[PDB]
A paper describes a structure:
Human GSTA1-1 (hGSTA1-1) is an effective catalyst for chlorambucil conjugation with GSH.
The hGSTA1-1 enzyme was crystallized in the presence of CBL and the X-ray crystal structure was determined by molecular replacement at 2.1 Å resolution. Difference Fourier electron density maps indicate the presence of a GSH moiety in the G-site of the enzyme. For both monomers, there is no electron density for the carboxylate moiety of CBL and for monomer B, the remaining CBL density becomes progressively poorer going from the thiol group to the aromatic ring of CBL. Comparison of the structure with those of previously reported hGSTA1-1/GSH complexes shows very few differences in the position of the GSH atoms with the exception of the thiol group of GSH which rotates in order to accommodate the bond with the CBL moiety. Comparison of the two structures shows few differences in the position of the protein side chains, with the exception of Phe10 side chain which rotates in order to form van der Waals contacts with the aromatic ring of CBL and significant differences in the positions of C-helix residues, in particular that of Met208.
Numbering used by the authors:
A (entry chain A): 4 to 220
B (entry chain B): 4 to 111, 116 to 220
The structure:
Amino acid sequence: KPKLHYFNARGRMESTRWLLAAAGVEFEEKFIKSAEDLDKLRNDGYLMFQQVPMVEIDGMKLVQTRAILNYIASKYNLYGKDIKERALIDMYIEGIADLGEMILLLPVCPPEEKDAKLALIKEKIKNRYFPAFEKVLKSHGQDYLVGNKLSRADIHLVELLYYVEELDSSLISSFPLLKALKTRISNLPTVKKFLQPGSPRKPPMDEKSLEEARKIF
Amino acid sequence: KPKLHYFNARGRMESTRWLLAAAGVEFEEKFIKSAEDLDKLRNDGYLMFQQVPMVEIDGMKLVQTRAILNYIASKYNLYGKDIKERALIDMYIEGIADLGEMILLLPVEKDAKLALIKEKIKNRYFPAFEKVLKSHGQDYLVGNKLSRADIHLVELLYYVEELDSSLISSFPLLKALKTRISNLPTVKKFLQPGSPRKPPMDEKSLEEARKIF
Ligand SMILES: N[C@@H](CCC(=O)N[C@@H](CSCCN(CCCl)c1ccc(CCCC(=O)O)cc1)C(=O)NCC(=O)O)C(=O)O
Ligand SMILES: N[C@@H](CCC(=O)N[C@@H](CSCCN(CCCl)c1ccc(CCCC(=O)O)cc1)C(=O)NCC(=O)O)C(=O)O
């Protein structure tokens, strides 16, 4: 079973957790608890650029978030049916990662500029990203973003919808098709199980855990 | 010809220019010069996220650097022969992308950062790739066949040279890869004068990237 090496938090590993679970793939997690736990992965030659996330899958040690996701998405037929579909998927998920990244780094952001950063994110969500995705759905009227078949684009998008909801549950209000997508995807057997309590889904970064991050890393 | 929409500068479109030319594909560039030119692309509905780079290729309008490079890489078989090779390729180029993003944003805490980038190149990135080349002793990074990994790395080797030519001294293999790749007919052509390759961003286009954006 795929072994995911990361600390006990969402961070850069959460999208992978969401994708595997959505693919109905059982995985393992080897939690880094200290800076010393990390140094060993390094000295043990497990980390190409001395960083995590690192995932042990099918005989090799993959680092770099996108390498991990691209591999899993292709293996479990969640990367579309051809080069053109992947292009759409890629364009969609890179837009999702751009927003996800901003949200992911808000708590690491220096205090004095946290307010401006959060306002900037909410503006982009309402005027740039949510409309872009709502439009995709309204254009073709299908249940999924691409090829009228479940793909990583739908998984990454809905995962983000949950983070936007925690940030401000009003942002998605004027985007019915998105709201509807979140519901459909959330009720797919695998995703519904991942969303249930006790699953490996991680909580939003709190405090004790951010302090542990700057400590380990 | 694929149509590249960006402003006359390297920025986020340079890696694409290198890839297309490496694949021997001729392209056209529609240079954005003003803030209005950028607004016209938006109003015409050509930018999914209101951003560039954006490339028109095979009938689609693709934005997002990685979406563009990924498509081009696969189309011209520069993305490995299978899923496992693509993973190695992706792992390699993403490390490259990380080091590039650092340099790409440097001009936009100056000293402290520069000294950090150099240390990472010397102690983290170059050793990682040097190690790769030594592990199999082949002319290319993956599957002993040219791939986007060779092109992006070599492109980066050039940028690192412009920054400090001494940084690649303790890495003989990276040095060698750079010479073989630069000698490939297509890459050599892109390296000679008059090619679409863009110059380092000086004071100007930095203010033009400021004005246009
Ligand atoms: N492009 C790479 C980046 C990999 C990377 O940055 N790895 C970090 C760890 S990523 C997890 C830690 N981190 C980044 C700073 Cl360390 C981080 C963790 C959690 C958050 C979340 C903050 C709260 C929130 O999510 O809102 C943000 C950053 C690492 O190993 N650093 C050590 C080193 O470089 O020497 C990839 O995507 O794999
Ligand atoms: N994830 C996307 C991001 C695309 C993106 O950032 N596009 C920018 C333009 S990227 C080119 C400009 N730029 C980034 C700030 Cl705008 C930039 C340009 C040149 C340099 C290089 C400086 C010199 C050096 O390389 O050292 C750095 C940044 C854009 O169109 N913004 C408009 C908006 O958001 O409303 C992608 O990778 O395609």
